[PDB]
Amino acid sequence: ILEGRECIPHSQPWQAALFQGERLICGGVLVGDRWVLTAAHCKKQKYSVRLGDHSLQSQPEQEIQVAQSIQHPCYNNSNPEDHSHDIMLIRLQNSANLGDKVKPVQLANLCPKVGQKCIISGWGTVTSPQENFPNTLNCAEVKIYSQNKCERAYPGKITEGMVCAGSSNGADTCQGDSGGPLVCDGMLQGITSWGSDPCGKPEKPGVYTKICRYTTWIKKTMD
Numbered sequence: 001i002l003e004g005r006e007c008i009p010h011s012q013p014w015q016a017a018l019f020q021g022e023r024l025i026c027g028g029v030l031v032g033d034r035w036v037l038t039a040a041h042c043k044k045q046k047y048s049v050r051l052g053d054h055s056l057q058s059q060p061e062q063e064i065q066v067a068q069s070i071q072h073p074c075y076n077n078s079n080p081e082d083h084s085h086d087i088m089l090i091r092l093q094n095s096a097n098l099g100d101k102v103k104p105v106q107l108a109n110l111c112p113k114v115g116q117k118c119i120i121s122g123w124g125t126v127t128s129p130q131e132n133f134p135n136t137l138n139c140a141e142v143k144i145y146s147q148n149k150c151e152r153a154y155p156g157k158i159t160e161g162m163v164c165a166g167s168s169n170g171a172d173t174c175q176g177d178s179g180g181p182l183v184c185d186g187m188l189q190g191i192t193s194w195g196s197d198p199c200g201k202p203e204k205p206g207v208y209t210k211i212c213r214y215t216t217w218i219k220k221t222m223d
């Protein structure tokens, strides 16, 4: 996360993290006691999920195994030029202990409206292009961009299942934040998908997988 700061400990209870040993792969979102949402491009043949964390060097915190990785059917593992349908549900091997410090987010039925102020968070790099990975969860305030301002920034790459967000002062998601949450007014509006290089350029905002477009698929898979 760029141009943000350390979040209030456990203030984002749904924040998950995909790990390959002691190596952070992506961020994630808790949507059920057995489900975690991420970007389909985060899929690995073997990885675990950490919840309730604030600092990565530290009883809310839990580490649970993955039973199943379910990418959106229309996602193409070949051709990573195409960021379409970059969403995936992870079925946990065991249930997560829910509490005030670890609880699922409420998915957004209504789509995000231009200008809406949201919050992006994660353990991704704090600078760009230089990699500087923080030890504690960072948080930043971002705003929902208009689709035309989003399309001009990425000619021919924006679909109706994507939404741009950013800040005039450079707040943005970056390396390691992928799969994480885009939360507006207490609700999950997006899953951080992709962006530009370097991150933090107002004219080149981060792109997010619009949750409102996929809520049908999401529920059908859990139930």
Ligand SMILES: *[C@@H]1O[C@H](CO)[C@@H](O)[C@H](O)[C@H]1NC(C)=O
Binding pocket: 076, 078, 079
């Ligand atoms: C993406 O998947 C489609 C599925 O029909 C395939 O035709 C296409 O060639 C794939 N993209 C690339 C670059 O291989």
